C-alpha cells in the first residue's frame, strides 16, 4: 500500500526533477522512501562513507558521526572509513546494529590545499577493500551534520550533488576552470551544472574511476605549474561534464542555512556545513 | 554547446516525469536527444527489435518495417527480428547502415490468446543468441506503424509503457487480475501503473529474465485451469509490479489517435496502432 502516482499531477512542479540526460534530480516529494528502502534491503546493500579528518578537522567528527547515525542511510549496513592523521583522536561513538567504522591513517600536508586534493588520491589508494566490503562509496566532508534524511533515494552508479551558491545560476557565472592550460578547464558555452566537491559518490567501481581520474588529472597540473581554481571541486565538474552522474542531488543534499537561509523551494535541509574560523 | 538546464525552470510541469522509484517517465521535452545519441554511440550499442507476425499479420510487416526506418533508433545499430510462420511473405525492405533483419520461423496456434501468448515463449528460446548479438531488446506489436522518433531515450535495463486508456485513471479501475488463483493476481489497494502489453524492453539480460518469468507464470496458470483476464499483458502489469521498470515510457510512445484523438499533453504521438477488423 502506498499512494498511486498520478501520471498527470506531478508531485514537484516548481523545480526541474530530472536531468536532459534523464537522470533523476533528487527533492523531497520525487520519492517514495519505502519502495526504495525495499528494493535496496533485498540486494542487502552496503553502503561505505568516507570522511578526511586531518590536523584540527578531527574536532568535527563527533557531531559528523552522531549525526549520520540518526539520518545517515538508517535501517542499511554502513562502514565509515575515516581517514586522519590522528586514531587516537576519533571518538568512540555508537553504532546502530549493521554499521561499523574503520579509521585509515595517513600523511598531513601543510597546505589545505593538498588536503582536500589528495583525498582523490587517497581514496583511490584504497582500492581492493573497497570493492569487497561496500557497494557504495559516499564521499564527503567532514566539517557537517546531517539534520535530516539521507538515505537509499541517493544511490546510483554515479551522483554529484548542486553547489548551493549556484543552482539559480546561469553557466556563464560557474566558477569552472577557464584555462585551457589545465586538465580542468570547462570552455564558456558548455557546462550542464555547477557541482560542489563535498558530496558525491556512486558505486565502488564509478568512484574509483572518477577519482583515478581526477588525481591522474590534478598531477598533470602540477607538472605543468598550475593548480586549478577551486580545486579537486574543478577537477570533479570536469568529470561530470564529461561522464555524466546517473543522479544528481538537490541542495537539500547540500545546504548552509547561516548564509543563505530556508526557501520555500528547500522542503528539507539534510546535511549542512558547520561554522568554521 | 545546447541549452542550459535550469535547476528552478522545469521543462515539463503538466505531467508526472519521474516515478517514487526515481524512474524516469519519457515524455517530450525531458530529454536532449543529442546528448543521449552521444552517450550510446560511445558504445557503439546495439538495438534488436522482436515482432511476431503470424498469419494475416504479415499484412502489418510492410509499413512497420518501413516506418521502423524512419524513426526507430536512426543513426544506430538495429536488429529487426521477425518471428513468422511465412518467411516468404516477410516483405523485402531496404535497410539502413548498420541494420539487419533476421526471420524466425515458427509454429502457429489457432487460438489468438495463445500467439500472444507464446510470445513470452518464443522471445525468451532465442536465449544464448540474443545476448551475443544485441545490447537491448525492444518488444513491440507488429500492427502499429511510427508516426515520429523512438530512440535512446527509452534504453534502460527494463521499461513499460503506460497504457494509453488508463494513464489518466486511479488503480481500481486498473484491469488487473483480480482472482488469486491466477499468477497474475494484483490486489485491490496495489499497482503503480497500468502498462501495455506491446511496448516493453531492456537489455538481453533484463528481458529474458521478465519473459522467463511471463511464461513460467502463465503455464502454472494452465495447470490450475485459468486464463489470466489480458493474458500476456496481466502478468506484464504482475512482473513489472513486483520488478520495477528502470525507465516508463510515456504514452506518446503507445497511442491510438483513432479512438482517444491528439491531446494538448502528447505533444508527439511516436508509435500507433494500425486499424484491423
Ligand atoms: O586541515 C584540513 C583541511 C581540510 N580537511 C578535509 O578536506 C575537507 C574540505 O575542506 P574544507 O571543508 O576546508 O573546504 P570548504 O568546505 O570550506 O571549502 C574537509 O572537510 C576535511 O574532510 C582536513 O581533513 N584537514
Ligand atoms: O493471428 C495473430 C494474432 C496476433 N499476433 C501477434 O500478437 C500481437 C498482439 O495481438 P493483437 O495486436 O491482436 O492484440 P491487440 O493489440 O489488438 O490487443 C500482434 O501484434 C502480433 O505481433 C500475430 O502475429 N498473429
Ligand atoms: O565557486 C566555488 C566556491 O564557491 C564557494 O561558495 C564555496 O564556499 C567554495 O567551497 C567553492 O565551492
Ligand atoms: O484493459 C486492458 C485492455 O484494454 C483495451 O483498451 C486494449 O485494447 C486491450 O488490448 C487491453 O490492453
Ligand atoms: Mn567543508
Ligand atoms: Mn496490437
Redesign the interface.
Known amino acids: ?2 499512494p ?23 527533492w523531497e516529494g ?3 522512501i519505502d ?2 528502502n525495499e ?1 535496496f534491503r533485498l540486494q542487502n546493500t552496503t553502503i561505505g562513507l568516507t570522511v578526511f579528518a586531518i590536523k584540527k578537522y578531527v574536532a568535527f567528527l563527533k557531531l559528523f558521526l552522531e549525526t549520520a547515525e540518526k539520518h545517515f542511510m538508517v535501517g542499511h549496513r554502513v562502514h565509515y572509513y575515516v581517514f586522519t592523521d590522528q586514531p587516537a583522536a576519533v571518538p568512540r561513538v555508537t553504532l546502530g546494529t549493521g554499521r561499523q567504522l574503520s579509521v585509515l591513517e595517513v600523511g598531513a600536508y601543510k597546505r589545505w590545499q593538498d588536503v582536500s586534493m589528495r583525498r582523490m588520491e587517497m581514496i583511490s589508494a584504497c582500492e581492493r577493500r573497497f570493492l569487497s566490503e561496500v557497494d557504495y562509496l559516499v564521499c564527503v566532508d567532514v566539517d557537517m551534520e546531517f539534520r535530516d534524511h539521507v538515505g537509499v ?1 541517493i544511490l546510483t552508479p554515479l551522483f554529484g550533488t ?1 553547489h548551493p551558491s549556484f ?2 545560476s ?2 556563464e557565472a560557474f566558477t569552472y576552470e577557464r584555462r585551457p592550460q589545465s586538465q580542468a578547464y570547462i570552455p564558456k ?5 555547477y557541482y560542489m566537491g563535498a558530496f558525491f559518490g556512486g558505486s565502488v567501481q564509478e568512484v574509483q574511476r572518477l577519482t583515478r581520474a581526477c588525481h591522474q588529472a590534478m598531477m598533470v597540473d602540477q607538472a605543468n605549474g598550475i593548480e586549478a581554481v577551486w580545486h579537486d571541486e574543478s577537477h570533479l565538474n570536469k568529470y561530470l561534464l564529461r561522464h ?1 552522474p546517473t ?1 544528481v542531488l ?1 541542495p537539500e543534499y547540500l545546504w548552509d542555512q547561516q548564509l543563505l537561509g530556508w526557501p520555500a ?1 528547500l522542503r528539507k535541509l539534510r546535511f549542512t556545513a558547520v561554522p568554521k574560523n
Open positions: 500500500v502506498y498511486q502516482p498520478k501520471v498527470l499531477t506531478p508531485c514537484r512542479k516548481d523545480v526541474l526533477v530530472v536531468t536532459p540526460w534523464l537522470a533523476p534530480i533528487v520525487t520519492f517514495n519502495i526504495l528494493q533515494e548542486l543552482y539559480g546561469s553557466r558555452d558548455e557546462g550542464d551544472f555524466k543522479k538537490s523551494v
